[PDB]
Structure formats: structure tokens, C-alpha cells
Design a protein around this ligand. Structure first.
Ligand SMILES: [Ca+2]
Lengths: 279, 11
């Protein structure tokens, strides 16, 4: 399948070179996989989700995304127009409030929730969790991410937007999960992207168009935007049977475009997520 | 959280 005039990030993850505008992908499109988006929530009613999104848990008064961040990230995972894995099932877990903030204890609870809840869902091709959040180092938060990964969920987390070494941030700094940095449309490391030896992979993160609340769309930037590209790619590859939850991060790194990125500091991987699609 | 969600950006 091919989507013409795709958002640049989708085109980029299906090409060996920057500057293309078509997203090429297998029609299976992540069908049979499930991705939990652990964030401010998801506007499940947005036409772009085609009824494939549901809120399953909230830690606040409502399950509504009053912010937009979670809806944007969910859109990049699996919306019709803006998504990597266009047929995947999306589950929303609201651990962040409508200002986009949340306590570490609530974030941990949300991770433990997903490890259990997945046992109640029909996801024959596997389960992914996308965490576009983080803050200062916490061994407890790292531990929660490690448990979630251990339980059989492919965990993808944002590296952070501090232009610093991600070793000082969580859950970015947990080695066992897939830590995602951001790039721009000219194959540069995004100016805000964290870096360091704990990064596993880069994905598109500057000027990413996706779904927003009120049935709208908008473009925003962050390692929050790169993370769902990798989460969606993982769901896509699991559905094709190329990899499993336990090994997807390594598979993505192995099959990445290598050496394409500029402004990568020594000691950080130069690897950009790539779907290897051939018609 | 300790990270983003603002919406009047930082570059
Ligand atoms: Ca890792």
C-alpha cells in the first residue's frame, strides 16, 4: 500500500533517504496488535481513529483528553491519515492531567495496570506501550518500565527534550525498554532531543502533524512525537511476524537506516527507524 | 510527568 502526500515522518520511516512524500507499507497495517498510549488520554471519538480507540483507565475525574498531547501521540501510532499502524487497536490510559502533568506514583500505577490489563484483551499479534512522558531520574519509575517490558509488552519511551544525556531522566534511562530520540526532516538530531548511550533508536520528532482534540489536527515537536512512530512500527512488525515484544527494539535497531543522521554526539547511536518495505 | 505539555514552544 502507499499513502501519497503523507506527513513527512511516515514517508521517512519507509525510505532510505530524506525528502520523499509517500508512505509505503504492508496492508496488514498492524491489524491484530494492540498499543496502549499512556498519556493525557485519547479523544476516542475522533473520526481518524475509525472506532479503533477506547479509553480503558483514568487516574483523574474524567477519562477525557482535555489537553491534546495523548490524542496527538495516539494519532501517530494508529490514526488513518497520520498513523504508522493504520489498523491497530488503541487503548488509552490517562496518567497525566489536562495540564500534561502527573505524579510518579500515578505513572507507575498506569504501567502496572497495563501489565495486567493486557491479559483481558484480544491482541493475538502482541502488545505495545507508548510512553511519551518522563522527568528526573527515579529508580522506581525505571523499575515499573522494566516490569512492563518483562510482562511481555514492547515498551517505547521518549528520550526527553532537554538536549542532555538521557541517563538523568526516567523512564528514558531504563536500559531494558526502547528509548527514542527525535530527528527532523533534514535528518538532523532535533535540537531539543536528549542523547547518550541509553538511546536505542531515533524517529521523526520535529513538526509532526497528527490528530488533536475537538476533532482537529496540529503539528507539534518533541521526543513525545518520535516515540509513537517507533511504537507504531513495532506493532506493524509484530503483525507481520518479523519480531516479538521481547526483541522488537533490537530488531528495529538492527534493520534501521544507519549513519544517516547529522549532529549525533559521539557515543550515541546513529540509527533511524525504518520499515524495510519492498512491494 | 516532569517533562512536557505547554503548547507555546521552546526553540
Ligand atoms: Ca534500551
Amino acid at each position: 500500500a502507499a499513502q501519497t502526500n503523507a506527513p513527512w515522518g511516515l514517508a521517512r520511516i519507509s525510505s532510505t533517504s530524506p525528502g520523499t512524500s509517500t508512505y509505503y507499507y504492508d496492508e496488514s497495517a498492524g491489524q491484530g496488535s494492540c498499543v496502549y498510549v499512556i498519556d493525557t488520554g485519547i479523544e476516542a471519538s475522533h473520526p481518524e481513529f475509525e472506532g479503533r480507540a477506547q479509553m480503558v483507565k483514568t487516574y483523574y475525574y474524567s477519562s477525557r483528553d482535555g489537553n491534546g498531547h495523548g490524542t496527538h501521540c495516539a494519532g501517530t501510532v494508529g490514526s488513518r491519515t497520520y498513523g504508522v499502524a493504520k489498523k491497530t487497536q488503541l487503548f488509552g490510559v490517562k496518567v497525566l492531567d489536562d495540564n500534561g502533568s502527573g505524579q510518579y506514583s500515578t505513572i507507575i500505577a498506569g504501567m502496572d495496570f497495563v501489565a495486567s490489563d493486557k491479559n483481558n484483551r484480544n491482541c493475538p499479534k502482541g502488545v505495545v506501550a507508548s510512553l511519551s512522558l518522563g522527568g528526573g531520574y527515579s529508580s522506581s519509575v525505571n523499575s515499573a518500565a522494566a516490569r512492563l517490558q518483562s510482562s511481555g509488552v514492547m515498551v517505547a519511551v521518549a528520550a526527553g527534550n532537554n538536549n542532555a544525556d538521557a541517563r538523568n531522566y526516567s523512564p528514558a534511562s531504563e536500559p531494558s525498554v526502547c528509548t527514542v530520540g527525535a530527528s527532523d526532516r533534514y535528518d538532523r538530531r532535533s535540537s531539543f532531543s536528549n542523547y547518550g548511550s541509553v538511546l536505542d533508536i531515533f524517529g521523526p520528532g520535529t513538526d509532526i502533524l497528527s490528530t488533536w482534540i475537538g476533532g482537529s489536527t496540529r503539528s507539534i515537536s518533541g521526543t513525545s512525537m518520535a516515540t509513537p512512530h517507533v511504537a507504531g512500527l513495532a506493532a506493524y512488525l509484530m503483525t507481520l511476524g518479523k519480531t516479538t515484544a521481547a526483541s522488537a527494539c533490537r530488531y528495529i535497531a538492527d534493520t534501521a537506516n544507519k549513519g544517516d543522521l547529522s549532529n549525533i554526539p559521539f557515543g550515541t547511536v546513529n540509527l533511524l527507524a525504518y520499515n524495510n518495505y519492498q512491494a | 510527568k516532569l517533562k512536557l505539555l505547554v503548547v507555546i514552544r521552546l526553540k
